[PDB]
Curated annotation (Swiss-Prot):
This is ATP-binding cassette sub-family C member 2. Glycans are attached at N7, N12. ATP 2 binds at G1189, R1190, T1191, G1192, A1193, G1194, K1195, S1196. It is linked to Dubin-Johnson syndrome: Autosomal recessive disorder characterized by conjugated hyperbilirubinemia, an increase in the urinary excretion of coproporphyrin isomer I, deposition of melanin-like pigment in hepatocytes, and prolonged retention of sulfobromophthalein, but otherwise normal liver function. GO terms for molecular function: ABC-type glutathione S-conjugate transporter activity; ABC-type transporter activity; ABC-type xenobiotic transporter activity; ATP binding; ATP hydrolysis activity; ATPase-coupled inorganic anion transmembrane transporter activity; ATPase-coupled transmembrane transporter activity; bilirubin transmembrane transporter activity. Pfam families: ABC_membrane, ABC_tran, TMD0_ABC. Belongs to the ABC transporter superfamily. ABCC family. Conjugate transporter (TC 3.A.1.208) subfamily. Changing W1109 to A/C: Fails to transport methotrexate, leukotriene C4 and estradiol glucuronide. Signal peptide: none annotated. It is a multi-pass membrane protein. PROSITE patterns: ABC_TM1F, ABC_TRANSPORTER_1, ABC_TRANSPORTER_2. It comes from Homo sapiens.
Length: 1393
């Protein structure tokens, strides 16, 4: 009874039938005033409860909030006085309408709830939310109509409720004012990111990002200028949530394998993030619905102009509806896209952090498979592939929806003829199936080859000094080139298959459209067909994305399910009688191989210093590692009471100052720091360093000697002040004086650690009498355990062994990475295109043009065939000639794509070859100054970007440009002056492009400079896992990674937002221009010719869309070319001396050994000082000489300068009358042999490590191995010589590694040989045997020995001593011992005389 209540008519058809239309007022006084109010009411309580949940604190009284409350209150007072006037009018003995009395009460109750909502919000972080703004917008849109009819009525006649009309006008004015005041948002004393504090109208258009883009345009950006991320998007929250879900899923899925890591990391990811997958799904449906509604509005508008007897308001209503629909669709799409992209960033960050966290606790048997380079791949290429699958996920289902709905409209117009089209769709299926199943395995092969290449590259970058000392560059260059060739061969086939898929996808719709009407027997269309082809053109991108993502997900899931390390063997009982107990323990390094340590049982009380001695390969370090628990238990248990401290045999040094390394995360003191430095005799050397204590060290202690590194490690261990100390040979690199001082001042009967228990493993019998108990290990088991005197009395093996024995100047090292500032130089473009090949470009451009001309000719043929040719064989031919054009355009887009694939690969090949070749020829300063993180980043991320992203962008751009050229040519076919409307549009589109490019490019560069500190930190942690796990400093080594990941996330999020800002601008501009063009033709409704206004609209839409796409394609191209620009920098680095020069020495150049220095001077860097000065000496023919000096004197530098690693700063060195500075580097480094101080071994097999040239047979290798005392161990191995060695030679002990190095140097049989501490970790027996071997083998040679053990140096023709780079004494050892000097005192300290 609506009519009875309002005393009016529900709806009159003739009311709007007149040219002037006016809907009934009571309809508006009801439905229009119900929608807005109800929305506010039935939504209010839920938001009230939400505000109640998040009630934390009250903000200050913002002037804006007070003003808005005052305005609402005055509106409420206006409603109240209107109600009072209504009551007064009704009091005059009359019957007022029900609506006139109910309305004011409804308005009063509404304003009251608004006041509460506006107030309650004061307690929330966002003062203006979507609720009120949407309510205001709905109220304005509803009240527009009422105002229209009311004012019309007033114009017709003033005899009405003028007071009512006036109060309604002032009320509508309040509503407009309130909305205006709402979009404003105060700084709310909030200096954080303005993302949180943002009005809804200012948050749907990204108006809060204008400041960053303005400052980027004014001046180049800076890392400090990017606002920090939101609280939720930090690393810790995602890490915790994903860790919980992944652990639950892994625990659930591990039980299945028991019935037999099967299938997970897809359920866990879905379960962790399933809110974000719902909002995007909801938005996609709305976007699609608006996408299908808009064409109907356009068709109705174009049909309006067909008849000239229509009304006036139809066109304006259609234009307004079109504008509103386009705006809403744009806003929904942008939001949907941003949601998809952000979840992509969240999942990437979670994966990276989880991978790093898992890397800390992997078992040895599982860590032997994944090295540093392989894992660095998983946290770069694989994780990035997962970032790219989120954008094309919902479009899978969305495509099927749009296809089905569009097909329905065809059936409406035509009949079952369109239906038959599904048959072709059925065929499209198996073809994709066969092509995809065939292309999946190629990605796996490519991933494996990339893993191998990076594994080789990392070790190459780590071992640069030995490569140069040995001149092994070309072999490794060829080794890398072969793998690159294999990888490119694999990638080519994948590119071809992608081209075939694209061809099929592009060809199918044309034949479908042809066969739609092919069946003549049977019985805007093309517009929808074209629309329908849009969701059926980008599917190949979807297919590639999910294939790559599936392979990545498989390889990560395999990695993350690795075995842990068992710890239920080392019981930490604080309540223990002593401090160490072994109940017949037996541990093994491998899973189930032979037990390295067998049947060990011993116990040592607290405060006892015991020494562990034995032969090479006995198993001492294995025992200490078992104590740490790095081996797999087999039988027994070990009880440990207290903490532990570790001093590894291979010293590990971090990056930073010496003070930071010594502290190792501890409160700085003064009464203990000084004591530690002085006791470890690290004081004199520290004084000589350029920066003193605050001197930068480097990545692996490159800027240090061996003794300095060992003493730094010992000082750190003694400063940390733990309970149990496990020293593994800490007095090997130092000489007699320093060793005696350290033993008498740090660890011994009277030292710093006089109370803590000490367990030291040693090879020298000098400090044995001052110990408490000694143990002699043999074959992994204890042979004899007793005190010094007892063992000597036993007359056992101990007696036999003893009888045989008797910023200021140079603090800043690493320079900050230089970031190009400004535009990208055209030289980069010229270089890249030149690599692809100029001729190849010509063939493609010509082919794509043929596609366009055919497209144009095909469209012209459509135009001719339409209109019935101005009113059946001719018709049959006209219908028939469509597959010619379709097949033509398909084969043209095939040749273009196919031809491009061959080119891009050839370019990626040339670029990588040039980069590798140039990097391999840099000096040592560049290698020691920059960490390996930057080089690895350039070798992996940029190469992957060049391989993958650039082609697609470049192919896409050429399509768009030719598209406009074609569209422009078609438009200019007629209406010649129409070309003018393009110029203002061109300027408008160019302007936004020349304002967003500056910020987009600089954000890209900043991202690729903040990505390396993540790789640079993952390499120094893996190398020092035992120290970290022994010192229990694990929780500290994760906050650094979290910070380093958050820094990169900060740049990535800001980049994605900038893309959205540009789109919402370009789409708005296109909407506005399209709407403006449509209205003008509406005004000219009487001057139209043959309704030509029909197509003038269709053309405008296509033009704007292509223009918008191009302005988006060009920006991407620039940001991706930045990657090639960053690659190019490492191609023009300073080079060393020429490898081979015109000056060529004759064969057998070194017929004798007559090295003769002459006042040699050398400095390591041009900024540092001189390390060698006044060196004048002579080496006689085939003379055995020995050089001995205190640590830091420079002996290693002296023997290093013979290989031209450092250019001479004055003076010259001659070898048989031929100055060294006049020959090629490979003309000298080739003829000499040297065994470096630090033994470094490559990966692969033992044979490859012995000679990576295949120039020797097996028999000579066996003989050389016998000569180096390695026959027993090698023969006892399962595989004779094909045994694999882990990276950095972790599969062998130090003694075996040194013996292997000696055996390797024993093969080249050169003329000049130099020893550099070849017996550092070798027992005296083996030392004597190898000394006899060297004496009997290198008789016809010149040998230089650098050994701190004077036993070997005793027999030599000349003995040289060094102190600070200056030779002090020189002469025969007998003369030096006879005359009281430094050598006599050194020998007396050694106790040999
Ligand atoms: N990381 C490892 N992986 C596998 N096997 C290993 C590993 N380290 C050592 N081994 C095996 O254990 C043997 C003994 O090594 P270990 O380092 O314990 O001996 P060591 O006597 O302490 O050596 P050194 O005297 O050189 O310090 C090796 O020869 C090798 O067979
Ligand atoms: N790569 C380097 N860069 C800069 N300075 C260096 C570098 N290597 C060494 N030095 C400086 O030269 C000093 C001597 O180093 P060097 O290795 O030549 O001494 P050494 O007496 O031969 O050592 P050791 O006796 O332990 O073998 C170092 O203490 C350091 O001050
Ligand atoms: C407040 C805003 C949103 C209103 C938007 C619509 C406005 C511009 C429209 C709606 C109704 C329109 C009026 C309808 C009828 C007449 C009578 C005619 O003899 C002169 C124009 C005049 C007076 C129109 C002026 C423009 C008008 C007021
Ligand atoms: C829907 C929202 C967004 C906008 C509403 C605009 C409405 C109220 C406007 C748009 C076009 C207008 C019409 C345009 C032309 C005429 C013809 C004239 O002789 C009488 C008024 C009349 C019939 C107008 C009435 C008001 C009108 C229908
Ligand atoms: C309402 C806002 C949001 C959009 C702007 C709509 C504009 C284009 C509409 C609103 C009112 C309209 C006018 C209303 C009345 C008339 C009188 C009629 O004899 C000729 C058309 C003319 C002159 C209309 C032209 C178009 C018009 C000005
Ligand atoms: C199939 C492909 C490889 C054919 C080659 C296309 C060439 C001619 C195209 C592709 C990308 C284009 C570049 C894209 C972006 C810019 C930045 C702009 O500020 C100047 C023009 C410049 C530098 C373009 C020059 C022409 C260009 C290099
Ligand atoms: C849809 C609309 C808002 C898009 C219009 C593009 C606007 C944002 C662009 C187009 C031209 C641009 C201006 C072009 C030139 C200058 C002069 C320079 O010294 C300061 C920036 C300034 C003042 C630019 C500011 C941004 C600008 C006004
Ligand atoms: Mg050892
Ligand atoms: Mg040395």
């Amino acid at each position: 009874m609506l009519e009875k209540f309002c005393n009016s008519t529900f709806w009159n058809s003739s009311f709007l039938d007149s040219p002037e239309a006016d809907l009934p007022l009571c309809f508006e006084q009801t439905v229009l005033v119900w929608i807005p109010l109800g929305y506010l009411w039935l939504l209010a309580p839920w938001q009230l409860l939400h505000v109640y949940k998040s009630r934390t604190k009250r903000s200050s009284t913002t002037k804006l909030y007070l003003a808005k409350q005052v305005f609402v209150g005055f509106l409420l007072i206006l409603a109240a006085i209107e109600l009072a006037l209504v009551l007064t009018e009704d009091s005059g003995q009359a019957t007022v309408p029900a609506v006139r009395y109910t309305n004011p009460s409804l308005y009063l109750g509404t304003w009251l709830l608004v006041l509460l909502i506006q107030y309650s919000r004061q307690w929330c972080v966002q003062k203006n939310s979507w609720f009120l703004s949407l309510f205001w917008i709905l109220s304005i849109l509803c009240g527009t109509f009422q105002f229209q009819t009311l004012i019309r009525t007033l114009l017709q006649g003033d005899n009405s409720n003028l007071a009512y009309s006036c109060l309604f006008f002032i009320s509508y004015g309040f509503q407009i004012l309130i909305l205006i005041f709402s979009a404003f948002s105060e700084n709310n004393e909030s200096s954080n990111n303005p993302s949180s504090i943002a009005s809804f109208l200012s948050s749907i258009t990204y108006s809060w990002y204008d400041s960053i883009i303005l400052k980027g345009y004014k001046r180049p950006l800076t890392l400090e200028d990017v606002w920090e991320v939101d609280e939720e998007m930090k690393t810790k929250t995602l890490v915790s949530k994903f860790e919980t879900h992944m652990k639950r899923e892994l625990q659930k899925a591990r039980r299945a394998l028991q019935r037999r890591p099967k299938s997970w990391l897809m359920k866990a990811l879905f379960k962790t993030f399933y809110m974000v997958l719902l909002k995007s799904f909801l938005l996609k449906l709305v976007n699609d619905i608006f996408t299908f509604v808009s064409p109907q509005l356009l068709k109705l508008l174009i049909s309006f102009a067909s008849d000239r007897d229509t009304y006036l308001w139809i066109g304006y209503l259609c234009a307004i509806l079109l504008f509103t629909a386009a705006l809403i669709q744009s806003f929904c799409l942008q939001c949907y896209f941003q949601l998809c992209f952000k979840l992509g960033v969240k999942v990437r960050t979670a994966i990276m952090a989880s991978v790093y966290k898992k890397a800390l606790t992997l078992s040895n048997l599982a860590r032997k498979e994944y090295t540093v380079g392989e894992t660095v791949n998983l946290m770069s290429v694989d994780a990035q592939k997962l970032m790219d699958v989120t954008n094309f996920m919902h479009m899978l289902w969305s495509s099927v929806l749009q296809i089905v709905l569009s097909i329905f409209f065809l059936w409406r117009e035509l009949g079952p003829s369109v239906l038959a089209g599904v048959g072709v769709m059925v065929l499209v299926i198996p073809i994709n199936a066969i092509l995809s199943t065939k292309s999946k395995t190629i990605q796996v092969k490519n991933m494996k080859n990339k893993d191998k290449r990076l594994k080789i590259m990392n070790e190459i970058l780590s071992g640069i000094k030995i490569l140069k000392y040995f001149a092994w560059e070309p072999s490794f260059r060829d080794q890398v080139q072969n793998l690159r060739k294999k990888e490119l061969k694999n990638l080519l086939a994948f590119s071809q298959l992608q081209c075939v898929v694209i061809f099929v996808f592009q060809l199918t719709p044309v034949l479908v459209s042809v066969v739609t009407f092919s069946v003549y027997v049977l019985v805007t269309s093309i517009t929808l067909f074209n629309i329908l082809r849009f969701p059926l053109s980008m599917l190949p991108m979807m297919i590639s994305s999910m294939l790559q993502a599936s392979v990545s997900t498989e390889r990560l899931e395999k990695y993350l399910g690795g075995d842990d390390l068992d710890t239920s063997a080392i019981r930490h009982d604080c309540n223990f009688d002593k401090a160490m107990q072994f109940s017949e323990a037996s541990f093994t390094w491998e899973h189930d191989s032979e037990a390295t340590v067998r049947d060990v049982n011993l116990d040592i009380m607290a405060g006892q210093l015991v020494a562990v001695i034995g032969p090479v390969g006995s198993g001492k370090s294995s025992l200490i590692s078992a104590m740490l628990g790095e081996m797999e238990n087999v039988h027994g248990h070990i009880t440990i009471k207290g903490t532990t401290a570790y001093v590894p045999q291979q010293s590990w040094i971090q990056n930073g100052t010496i003070k930071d390394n010594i502290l190792f995360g501890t409160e700085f003191n003064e009464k203990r720091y000084q004591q530690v430095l002085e006791a470890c005799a690290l004081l004199p050397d520290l004084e000589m360093l350029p920066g003193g204590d605050l001197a930068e060290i480097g990545e692996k202690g490159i800027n240090l000697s061996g003794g300095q590194k060992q003493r730094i490690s010992l000082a750190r261990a003694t400063y940390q002040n733990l309970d149990i100390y496990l020293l593994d040979d800490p007095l090997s690199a130092v000489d007699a004086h320093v060793g005696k001082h350290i033993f008498n001042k740090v660890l011994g009967p009277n030292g710093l650690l006089k109370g803590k228990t000490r367990l030291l493993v040693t090879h020298s019998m000098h400090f044995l009498p001052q110990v408490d108990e000694i143990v002699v290990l043999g074959n992994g088991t204890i042979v004899e355990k007793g005190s010094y005197s007892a063992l000597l009395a036993k007359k056992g093996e101990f007696a036999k062994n003893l009888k045989t024995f008797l910023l200021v100047k140079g603090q800043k090292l690493i320079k900050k990475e230089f970031i190009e500032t400004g535009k990208v130089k055209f030289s980069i473009y010229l270089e890249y295109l030149q690599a692809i090949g100029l001729f190849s470009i010509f063939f493609i451009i010509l082919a794509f043009v043929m596609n366009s001309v055919a497209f144009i000719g095909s469209n012209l043929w459509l135009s001719a065939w339409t209109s019935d040719s101005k009113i059946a064989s001719q018709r049959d031919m006209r219908v028939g000639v469509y597959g010619a054009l379709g097949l033509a355009q398909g084969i043209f887009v095939f040749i273009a794509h196919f031809w491009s694939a061959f080119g891009f690969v050839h370019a990626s090949n040339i670029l990588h070859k040039q980069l590798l070749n140039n990097i391999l020829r840099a000096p040592m300063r560049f290698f020691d100054t920059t960490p390996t993180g930057r080089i690895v980043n350039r070798f992996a991320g940029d190469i992957s970007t060049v391989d993958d992203t650039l082609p697609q962008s470049l192919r896409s751009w050429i399509t768009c440009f030719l598209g406009i050229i074609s569209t422009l040519v078609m438009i200019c076919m007629a209406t010649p002056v129409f070309t003018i409307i393009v110029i203002p549009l061109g300027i408008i589109y160019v302007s936004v492009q020349m304002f967003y490019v500056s910020t987009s490019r600089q954000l890209r560069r900043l991202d690729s400079v903040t990505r390396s500190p993540i790789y640079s930190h993952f390499s120094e942690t893996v190398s020092g896992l035992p120290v970290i796990r022994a010192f229990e400093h694990q929780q500290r080594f994760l906050k650094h990674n979290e910070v380093r990941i958050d820094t990169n996330q900060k740049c990535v999020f800001s980049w994605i937002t900038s893309n959205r800002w540009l789109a919402i601008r370009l789409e708005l501009v296109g909407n506005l221009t399209v709407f403006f063009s449509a209205l003008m033709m509406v005004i000219y409704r009487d001057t139209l010719s043959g309704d030509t206004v029909g197509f003038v609209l269709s053309n405008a839409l296509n033009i704007t869309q292509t223009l918008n796409w191009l302005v988006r394609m060009t920006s991407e191209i620039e940001t991706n070319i930045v990657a090639v620009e960053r690659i190019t920098e490492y191609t023009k680095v300073e080079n060393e001396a020429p490898w081979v020069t015109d000056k060529r020495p004759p064969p057998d150049w070194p017929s004798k050994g007559k090295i003769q220095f002459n006042n040699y001077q050398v400095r390591y860097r041009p900024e540092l000082d001189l390390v060698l000065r006044g060196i004048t000496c002579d080496i006689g023919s085939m003379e055995k000489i020995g050089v001995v000096g205190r640590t830091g004197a420079g002996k290693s530098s002296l023997t290093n300068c013979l290989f031209r690693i450092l250019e001479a700063a004055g003076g010259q060195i001659i070898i048989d009358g031929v100055d060294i500075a006049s020959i090629g580097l490979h003309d000298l480094r080739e003829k000499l042999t040297i065994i470096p101080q630090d033994p470094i071994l490559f990966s692969g097999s033992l044979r490859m490590n012995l000679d990576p040239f295949n120039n020797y047979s097996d028999e000579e290798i066996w003989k050389a191995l016998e000569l180096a005392h390695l026959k027993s161990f090698v023969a006892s191995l399962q595989l004779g010589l094909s045994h694999e060695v882990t990276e950095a030679g972790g599969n062998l002990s130090i003694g075996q590694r040194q013996l292997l190095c000696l055996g390797r140097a024993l093969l080249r049989k050169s003329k000049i040989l130099v020893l550099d501490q070849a017996t550092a970790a070798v027992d005296l027996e083996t030392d004597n045997l190898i000394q006899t071997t060297i004496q009997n083998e290198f008789a016809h040679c010149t040998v230089i020995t650098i050994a701190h053990r004077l036993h070997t140096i005793m027999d030599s023709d000349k003995v040289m001593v060094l102190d600070n780079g200056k030779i002090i004494e020189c002469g025969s050892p007998e003369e030096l011992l006879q005359i009281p000097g430094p050598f006599y005192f050194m020998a007396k300290e050694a106790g040999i005389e």
